[PDB]
Structure 1
Amino acid sequence: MDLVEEILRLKEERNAIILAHNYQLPEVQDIADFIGDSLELARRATRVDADVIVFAGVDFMAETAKILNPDKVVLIPSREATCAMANMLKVEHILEAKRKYPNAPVVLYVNSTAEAKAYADVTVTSANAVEVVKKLDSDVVIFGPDKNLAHYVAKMTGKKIIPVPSKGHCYVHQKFTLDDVERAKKLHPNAKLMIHPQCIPEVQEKADIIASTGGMIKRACEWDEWVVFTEREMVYRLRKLYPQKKFYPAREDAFCIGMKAITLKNIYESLKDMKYKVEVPEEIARKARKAIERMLEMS
């Protein structure tokens, strides 16, 4: 079967757009209308003229698109496409930190449930986390859920960061160790290292550039040979964007299972049956909308 043909005709007949993340399968990225990191996906979700949004990504990404487009239909092709790090942060975690630090603003990674965003003062992505926290008036900030990004933000802003929870992390990026850095410099001595801020601090210290996947794309021009310390599919995105550069994955087992829950087949089935509809309750969506919008205007 030619899934590509059927997906494109059905998408066009339903006035739908496909938004994919850089971690999506190569066959998914090839049919996507727009590809970017979480921040670029959020800003693209504010200029959607289509009636239907098919989100080739994880659940928190689709919910963010739904919060920014309550009048539109937002479809996620599989409800198992979830983010392990996002689900580590609970509402009770935030309430506990707000009781312990009443005058500290709550700054949440976009990788978070919609219910968690309802208690956040402003959201952040990997590309704008430092800029937003630096622009906050308070010197003590409640931050979550990713502990490794919190370390990078504390280093780059000089703020006192209260991490919530204590062990919040992404298992995909925590696979990278110092041994991978030493191996990369040995097998590619002329390459430079682009490392995601969700990696452990000791790995971040060895990086040439620390950035989100969007920041990796904007700064890939500074060199011609890169070892990429992030999810595996990002290397495909970089290789196709820059056919005359060299990119190597730091680990071939650094793949996100939740991201690969999206396939070409369930995208077709998503457009065929208008499923699965992403819904956010009004009270939760309204409070989260203010934090997401504040992020958009602060970055």
Structure 2
Amino acid sequence: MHHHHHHMVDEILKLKKEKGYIILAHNYQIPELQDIADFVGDSLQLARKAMELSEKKILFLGVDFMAELVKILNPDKKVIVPDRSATCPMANRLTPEIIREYREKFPDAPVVLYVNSTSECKTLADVICTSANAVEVVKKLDSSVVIFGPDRNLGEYVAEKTGKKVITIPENGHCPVHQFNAESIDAVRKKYPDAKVIVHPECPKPVRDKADYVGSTGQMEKIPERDPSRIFVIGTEIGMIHKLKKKFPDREFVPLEMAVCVNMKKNTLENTLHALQTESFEVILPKEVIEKAKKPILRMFELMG
């Protein structure tokens, strides 16, 4: 890397060791930040890993609902973030008011909230799910009808796999990063006839349908353990390409299209250094939010394994 960035990385690691921080980074952080992190993964993987740590201070590198997820499950640890504006546009479009409107219209349908959702919305969820476990969570629920949000694509995917009725909220709730074009897959089928295409379930239906595999980032990681393909084309955010290439240096990983989450890219070497220097910004939740949000997480845990 550029020599100046090297010096920033060195000072970041000096400060985190000095001040007793563990650094957690999401799969979609820039490579330089994945590289300095102690652990890199999806939101739940990170929140759970943190629960095993003896350190009491976490520098979280991702977006707000994820840092808050870490805080909800590690409420006695100090969690900081470099940029308080780093957020999830898809998650923020669902509001507690919208959930309320739907609970009343469909009083016998459990509210299943994807982990990509604001902490406030989680207080009103019956159960949380991840993109990896959503299908099995919904299958295990006794109701044949669920309210599901905030992603319409994941909801629709769940409906296909479970055969249950899924009422997705809010209307056209989606992730823009995962809105790949189906013709991009057609182009890879011609270019790389032996490559396997793996996409996220937040992708739209004709993208999912043309893929060899549909899975969460955690699932993408595991696929090349068993699949012997030399080339994987990956339908998710570009940060995952770095993660995959590091894990499987013997294969190639091609992004299906260049997809960048602007909010994820808000964290930089500069503001990560500043966060360790100043130990800001702390993630602080009202007690009511930590307790209420935690219940549908715990319920997910109960249903799932």
Please report the TM-score for the alignment, with normalisation by the length of structure 1. 0.97
Q: Which residue of 2 aligns with 1:275?
A: 280
Q: Which residue of 2 aligns with 1:244?
A: 250
The CA deviation at 1:296 is 2.5
Counterpart of 2:210 in 1: which secondary structure? coil
The CA deviation at 1:42 is 2.7
Structure 2 residue corresponding to 1:232, chosen from 238, 248, 273: 238
| Paired AA for residue 147 in structure 2 | I
Q: Which runs of at least 4 in structure 1 moved beyond 3 Å after TM superposition?
A: none
| Alignment pair present for 1:217 and 2:213 | no
Structure 1 residue corresponding to 2:88, chosen from 80, 83, 99: 83
| Alignment pair present for 1:19 and 2:19 | no
Could you tell me how far apart the structure 2 residues matched to 1:216 and 1:43 are?
19
Contact 1:39 1:127 in 2 (8 A): no
User: After superposition, where does 1:1-299 map in structure 2 within 5 Å?
Assistant: 1=4, 2-174=7-179, 176-221=180-225, 222-224=227-229, 225-252=231-258, 254-299=259-304
Contact 1:142 1:162 in 2 (8 A): yes
Could you tell me how far apart the structure 2 residues matched to 1:266 and 1:118 are?
31
Counterpart of 1:205 in 2: which secondary structure? helix
| Paired AA for residue 262 in structure 1 | N
Aligned length: 297
Contact 2:48 2:73 in 1 (8 A): no
RMSD: 1.0
Could you tell me how far apart the structure 1 residues matched to 2:301 and 2:84 are?
27
The CA deviation at 1:231 is 0.5
Deviations along 1:149-182, one digit per CA (max 9) or x if unpaired, are: 00111111111101110111000001x1111111
Could you tell me how far apart the structure 2 residues matched to 1:66 and 1:193 are?
35
Could you tell me how far apart the structure 1 residues matched to 2:145 and 2:50 are?
31
| Paired AA for residue 52 in structure 2 | R
The range that moved more, 216-225 or 159-168, is 216-225
Counterpart of 1:67 in 2: which secondary structure? helix
Could you tell me how far apart the structure 2 residues matched to 1:298 and 1:24 are?
30
Could you tell me how far apart the structure 2 residues matched to 1:261 and 1:298 are?
35
The CA deviation at 1:40 is 1.3
The CA deviation at 1:297 is 3.1
Counterpart of 2:147 in 1: which secondary structure? strand
| Paired AA for residue 116 in structure 1 | C
Contact 1:39 1:125 in 2 (8 A): yes
Contact 1:143 1:163 in 2 (8 A): yes
Deviations along 1:265-296, one digit per CA (max 9) or x if unpaired, are: 11111111111111111111111011112223
Contact 2:47 2:74 in 1 (8 A): no
Contact 1:22 1:37 in 2 (8 A): yes
Deviations along 1:78-104, one digit per CA (max 9) or x if unpaired, are: 012111111111111100110011111
Structure 2: gaps of 5 or more residues: none
Please report the TM-score for the alignment, with normalisation by the length of structure 2. 0.95
Counterpart of 2:148 in 1: which secondary structure? strand
Deviations along 1:157-211, one digit per CA (max 9) or x if unpaired, are: 111101110111000001x111111111122111010010000011101111110
The CA deviation at 1:248 is 0.7
Contact 1:43 1:296 in 2 (8 A): no
Counterpart of 1:172 in 2: which secondary structure? helix
Identity %: 54
The CA deviation at 1:39 is 2.7
Contact 2:43 2:69 in 1 (8 A): no
The CA deviation at 1:47 is 1.4
Could you tell me how far apart the structure 2 residues matched to 1:38 and 1:74 are?
14
Structure 1: gaps of 5 or more residues: none
Counterpart of 2:89 in 1: which secondary structure? coil
Contact 1:124 1:132 in 2 (8 A): yes
Contact 2:196 2:232 in 1 (8 A): yes
The CA deviation at 1:223 is 2.9
Could you tell me how far apart the structure 2 residues matched to 1:296 and 1:9 are?
36
Contact 2:150 2:174 in 1 (8 A): yes
